[PDB]
């Protein structure tokens, strides 16, 4: 249960002094994921739907490397640069979480995100 690191080449390499996720006392604390394609290191196109899809795939990669799944996510925070993009984010986020007990959640409009991203999603999960 002591603090352990999660590292996978299937999620973006850390672009700063942080770990992709930390497991501790049965909780996986994921870094906020932005819409970087892990294979190229580039932000995907300036399109909220494509970016939401990329973020959720990056989160999934972190969960898999930790040996857990999206069904175990307890709580998320959505940081978006335009509150009017909430519905398009929700429409895809729901697809990802369909059939699970939906996590608790907060959504707020931020003024800017790393690399000019439109959305960043942070999750905590059970291990």
């Amino acid at each position: 249960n002591a603090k352990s690191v999660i590292e996978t080449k299937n999620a973006p390499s850390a672009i700063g002094p942080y770990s992709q996720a930390i497991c501790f006392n049965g909780i996986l604390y994921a870094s906020g994921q932005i819409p970087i394609n892990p294979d190229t290191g580039d932000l995907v196109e300036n399109d909220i739907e494509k970016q939401t899809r990329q973020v959720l795939k990056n989160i999934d990669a972190v969960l898999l490397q930790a040996g857990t799944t999206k069904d175990k996510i307890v709580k998320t925070t959505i940081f978006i640069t335009n509150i009017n993009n909430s519905s398009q984010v929700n429409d895809i986020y729901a697809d990802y979480f369909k059939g699970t007990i939906f996590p608790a959640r907060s959504t707020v409009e931020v003024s800017a995100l790393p690399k000019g991203a439109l959305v960043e999603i942070e999750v905590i999960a059970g291990v």
Copy 2:
């Protein structure tokens, strides 16, 4: 395993989220905005009225989970106007009077769901 909290005394979750999730003895509440649960609409565009509603909604979630506000360990206050901090704080202080005050973070954001002026997220012991 995680378990859901659902009560008609708190605003219906529209987006693909649960009002709160309990896991390993901790209640993770969704951020509450100043919705009247009976209508789904925000209350008046007044920071004091909205803060009061948020806290009522939080109370309803805690009660359904079988816990209380004195078990809250940490909150985050998201407000659209940092100049409203004093008014939010005084109502928040009255809500927590007589308890060990939670840890807290406060930030100003440029917008909130439904055009709310305030959104408060809490974590509690169950």
Copy 3:
């Protein structure tokens, strides 16, 4: 079971909040802004001085709680200018040298308490 952390070497908790709460083996720290506890006033608008003051304040909380920065699992960095990310990162990296870096999220918010450039919230094992 929840317990308060209080130290005169972090900014006085004016009003309804605790500097940090410990519960079930986790330290939930309040977000720290660059108030100098020696003066009670905010540090000048130099992102490096403010980031160092924030980390000094976090250090004081960890010390009083009987834990260390090696046990931090997650931080959130709220900044008023995303262009300050690099300067914050370099200081934050020196701070965490020799530890497994925490999980993290960094976002630019519309404003912070007292007009601060940076607020950092941490979660740690006790």
